[PDB]
TrEMBL record, chain B:
It comes from the Eukaryota. Residues 5-344 form the Kinesin motor domain. This is Kinesin-like protein. It comes from Plasmodium falciparum Tanzania (2000708). Belongs to the TRAFAC class myosin-kinesin ATPase superfamily. Kinesin family. The lineage of its organism: Eukaryota, Sar, Alveolata, Apicomplexa, Aconoidasida. ATP binds at residues 98-105. Residues 195-214 are annotated as: Disordered. Residues 196-214 have a biased composition (Polar residues).
Length: 426, 347
């Protein structure tokens, strides 16, 4: 009961997905072969949420891997945990998208997509009651953004009543990796606005800050960064996988955190986060976790929560904890930091608690905030788009893939509207 | 510059023979043109209830039409000036509203029979326009679309299937691939629309044999130019828009069909979106402190209607209710919505 379907689109998305799978298999006591070697019966009770049971006491991720390039697939298959995936669930093209949203959405991606659709239909049929979909990808390139968006549109058309979740790695302001990133982000964000029910805005710059400042990590690799994201992902759906004292799944979270249809862009966070040295000089207690989570410098989106207000915040706690203590701490934070919370939604905080902690830790926390500061992310992007579009820079490539200028105009308008709406509700 | 103007009227249907045969009591009384009272049929057994007298539930309107009102009377005393606004180069919008089964389609649009005010709207439009045509050539174009599960059906020409909305240079809204018929008479547009009704998604629900599952949106464009076609012209394209709002639904207790539950939710959501858009437009028109974005984005209905709703336009909400206590709850909710559509405490 309550099966989730996982989709990974483009290189980054795939990489994050791999990490996610690795963590979750470890959590549920699943080895690199698909066999259960755990101790606790609780690890297998709700195994069906993320895994299909294959013949001969093995488990396989309900995961679809998508890319316009084959190399990524190979890299995944050769990775630790690569062999756990169903071979028929790898759907790859041969060409690539060349950082072009149009190639991913209209051309190469279009050709690819039917196969993916066929796979995912089968995966849906297999599951007794699919609660919904989780897509991991980025907005800045061509595949994850254009192809991903296309896929999402198709999915929603066939499953309009199911929950649609995306973990979207967004382009940061300073660390600009590509030149057409503004275009790709703009086009994809628009589509996300209409077709996702909740969107987790993850930002590389913020991750780097976390790694450098909070973990004090000498050399971050993408794997390390990805780990953080994976942890966050695991946090959200802990209530579907384990028992607890107060239980909240994907739907319950959405209903409590989304007051208006369009405002479904979250700034996620995780706690605790310490170095090796600073491990000894700390208190493993709920007050400390709470303190950590609400800090601006612990957000995985490059936005200052102190530049806006929290519309709603959901906190998900894992480990053996006193409910009273949890409640006290959340009330204290809202009373003390009154100015950071919208005053016309009393009790801006939703709490959920799962008894099963993550491995290595006795207590852990996951944060989901709907903050009006997310407007900053959109605004910058809009500005950059304007700067490009005013001089029609790089437009020709997109137009060569069948895209028309008017779409760009529309998307930009839409994003502007969204920004305005956030501002006004602040 | 939101200068939004919306009149709110309501038509009380005459109590039907079926309602009389079923013992219906008269919950609806009209005290004035400006107001209607719905007599909530409480048993009043408690002293508190007898003291409060909650039975007298008042709602605020510009013109409440009683049980004897006809299609011609609704036209003459409500949309008549909206037609004029279009003739004069402005946009205007009419919204039919009520619980499904309320008779919205027949009062406003018709379906071969019961011409509705839509016939009357076009009948005067074309008489005035044909006269004006002597100096200013007119092209009265007509489209008819279906807004269903946020997708748009071309009703006049179903071969375009389900369409999206796009922003124009100068950001008005166009439905892609919609058929536009240039007409000269009400007979042409009325038959065109009634034929188009054949392509609407409708189902035999418990509350209504013909319950619309969608918002039927008429877009009649009164395009004009001085007949001196070789001269530069500041032409007009006033749009006379009429919306058959999907009926409100709370029949999901028995409508357990997957699609009816989907449609129901989308209908109610978009009816509420319209409500929120209206509240915002009214607040801005009033000049309140609520300076913000009008949430036209909340539905395809409102995104499209933005072009008339946010400007120097005349709009009208025409609700449909019943005097019978047997449907008190539907009349109550219908009146409540309409009251909130107006947002004026004159009653
Ligand atoms: N947080 C992470 N970000 C990544 C990772 N790999 C790439 N990226 C970021 O994503 C962007 C590059 O995206 P992709 O390689 O996924 C583009 P994709 O392969 O999906 O389509 P193509 O345009 O066909 O290459 C850029 O901002 C990178 O800095 C990762 O492992 N973690
Ligand atoms: N006294 C007490 N209250 C509880 C307990 N568990 C949850 N609550 C309270 O119950 C309310 C939340 O409702 P739940 O019972 O968890 O929700 P539910 O009935 O399962 O409804 P859904 O999960 O929304 O389907 C809150 O006021 C909690 O504080 C408990 O063990 N004891
Ligand atoms: Mg790639
Ligand atoms: Mg419950």
């Amino acid at each position: 009961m309550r099966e989730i379907v996982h989709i990974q689109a483009g290189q980054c998305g795939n990489q994050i997905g791999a990490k996610f799978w690795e963590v979750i298999s470890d959590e549920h006591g699943i080895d690199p072969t698909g066999s259960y070697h755990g101790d606790s019966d609780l690890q297998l009770e709700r195994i069906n949420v993320y895994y299909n049971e294959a013949a001969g006491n093995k488990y396989v991720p309900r995961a679809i891997l998508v890319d316009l390039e084959p190399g990524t697939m190979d890299s995944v298959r050769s990775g630790p945990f690569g062999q756990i995936f169903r071979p028929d669930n790898f759907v790859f093209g041969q060409s690539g998208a060349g950082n072009n949203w149009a190639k991913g959405h209209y051309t190469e991606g279009a050709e690819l997509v039917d196969s993916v659709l066929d796979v995912v239909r089968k995966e849906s049929e297999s599951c007794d009651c699919l609660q919904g979909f989780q897509l991991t990808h980025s907005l800045g390139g061509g595949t994850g953004s254009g192809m991903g968006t296309l896929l999402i549109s198709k999915i929603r058309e066939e499953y309009p009543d199911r929950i649609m979740n995306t973990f979207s790695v967004v382009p940061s302001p300073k660390v600009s990796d590509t030149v057409v990133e503004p275009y790709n982000a703009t086009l994809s964000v628009h589509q996300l606005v209409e077709n996702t029910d909740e969107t987790y805005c993850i930002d590389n710059e913020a991750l780097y800050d976390i790694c450098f400042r909070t973990l004090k990590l000498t050399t971050p690799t993408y794997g390390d960064l990805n780990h953080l994201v994976s942890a966050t992902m695991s946090g959200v759906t802990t209530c579907l996988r384990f028992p607890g004292q107060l239980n909240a799944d994907l739907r319950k979270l959405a209903v409590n955190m989304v007051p208006f249809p369009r405002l479904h862009f979250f700034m996620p966070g995780f706690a605790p986060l310490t170095s090796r040295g600073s491990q000894q000089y700390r208190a493993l207690t709920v007050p400390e976790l709470t303190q950590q989570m609400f800090d601006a410098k612990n957000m995985m989106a490059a936005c200052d929560p102190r530049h806006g207000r929290y519309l709603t915040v959901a906190a998900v706690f894992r480990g053996r904890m006193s409910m009273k203590e949890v409640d006290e701490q959340m009330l204290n934070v809202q009373n003390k930091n009154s100015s950071y919370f919208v005053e016309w939604i009393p009790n801006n905080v939703k709490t959920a608690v799962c008894d099963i902690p993550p491995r290595g830790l006795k207590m852990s926390a996951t944060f989901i905030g709907n903050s009006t500061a997310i407007q900053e992310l959109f605004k910058r992007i809009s500005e950059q788009f304007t700067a490009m579009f005013r001089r029609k820079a790089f437009l020709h490539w997109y137009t060569g893939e069948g895209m028309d200028e008017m779409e760009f105009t529309e998307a930009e308008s839409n994003m502007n509207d969204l920004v305005s709406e956030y501002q006004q509700y602040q | 510059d939101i200068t939004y103007n919306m009149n709110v009227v309501i038509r009380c249907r005459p109590m039907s023979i079926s309602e009389k045969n079923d013992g219906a009591k008269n919950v609806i009384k009209i005290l004035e043109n400006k107001m209607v009272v719905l007599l909530d049929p409480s048993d009043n057994s408690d002293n508190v209830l007898r003291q409060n007298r909650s039975r007298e539930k008042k709602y605020v309107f510009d013109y409440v039409f009683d049980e004897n009102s006809s299609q011609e009377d609704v036209y003459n005393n409500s949309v008549k000036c909206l037609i004029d606004a279009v003739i004069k180069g402005y946009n205007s919008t009419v919204f039919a509203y009520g619980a499904t089964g309320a008779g919205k389609t027949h009062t406003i649009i018709g379906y071969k029979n019961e011409p509705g005010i839509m016939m009357m709207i076009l009948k005067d439009l074309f008489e005035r326009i044909k006269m004006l045509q002597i100096m200013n050539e007119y092209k009265v174009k007509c489209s008819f679309i279906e807004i269903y599960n946020e997708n748009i059906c071309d009703l006049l020409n179903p071969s375009n299937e389900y369409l999206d909305v796009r922003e124009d240079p100068i950001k008005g809204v166009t439905v892609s691939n919609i058929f536009e018929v240039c007409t000269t008479s009400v007979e042409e547009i009325m038959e065109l629309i009634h034929t188009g009704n054949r392509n609407r998604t409708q189902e035999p629900t418990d509350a209504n044999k013909t319950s619309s599952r969608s918002h039927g949106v008429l877009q009649v464009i009164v395009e004009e130019t001085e007949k001196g076609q070789g001269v530069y012209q500041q032409t007009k394209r006033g749009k006379l828009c009429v919306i058959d709002l999907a009926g409100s639904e709370r029949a999901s207790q028995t409508n357990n069909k997957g699609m009816r539950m989907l449609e129901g939710a989308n209908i109610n959501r978009s009816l509420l979106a319209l409500g929120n858009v209206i509240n915002a437009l009214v607040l801005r028109s009033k000049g309140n402190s609520k300076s913000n974005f009008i949430p036209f984005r909340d539905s395809k209905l409102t995104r499209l209607l933005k072009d008339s709703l946010g400007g120097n336009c005349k709009t009208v909400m025409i609700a449909n209710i019943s005097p019978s206590h047997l449907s008190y709850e539907d009349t109550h909710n219908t009146l409540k919505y309409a009251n909130r559509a107006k947002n004026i405490k004159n009653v």
